[model samples]
Target: SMSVKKPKRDDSKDLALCSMILTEMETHEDAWPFLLPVNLKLVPGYKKVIKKPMDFSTIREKLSSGQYPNLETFALDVRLVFDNCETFNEDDSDIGRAGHNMRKYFEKKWTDTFK
Candidate 1:
């Protein structure tokens, strides 16, 4: 019988990057819709369709928990917030517009800072 080990990735640098981006994302004008989990009552059937729901507050808590292993790993959750947004909202809708705007900002911010 072999032992099963839990492996952890060193993410010290990644944690700093993630927190900085998170702070900026939280303060963004378009952040209103993504500050917390998508409310089912507000969008009835949200969980039924959104495969992976995400939000800024959740990301912040996750960061504090120290599980992110890499910057790219953290990035996936950030992108998911926008993906779920696009999936649930019409492009012309108020929240939808903010989602689109914030996504582009996130991309630019990530590219500029990561490289």
Candidate 2:
């Protein structure tokens, strides 16, 4: 009865699943900078350059407030943080690399969770 196929969880249950993913993701070594939004006072240029900034702590707040109605919306916002990171910090910068690693953990961890 074995067949090759991708695993996906039930849609309605994913909100609870998202909660689990967030805590697990926080455990990653590179999650430091992403644990919070960038401070405009210190990184003033970041505000001007990377508008619409996103962060894990803020995303958790969204989940806390029940802002994400579904996993799709939640996942999109998660990607947005990384997308902004790629453009703002660029790939070679250390903070950029942190975001890259943060994103990798997210993708693979989500896969594992959703599976």
Leading candidate by lDDT? 1
Q: How do the residues 1-115 of candidate 2 rate in per-residue lDDT, one tens digit apiece?
A: 3697678655877878898888877777888878898898898688888878888999999999989978879998889889988987868988899988888888997888775
Candidate 2 ranges beyond 4 A from true positions: 1-9
The candidate 2 region of ten consecutive residues with least summed lDDT is: 1-10
- Tell me the tens digit of each residue's lDDT in model 1 across 12-103: 57678778888999999889999998887787879789878899999899888976767887899999999999999999999999999999
TM-score of each: 0.85, 0.83
How far out, in Å, is residue 57 in model 1?
A: 0.6
The per-prediction CA RMSD against the true structure, in angstroms, equals 4.7, 5.9
Residue 89 alpha-carbon offset, candidate 1, angstroms: 0.2
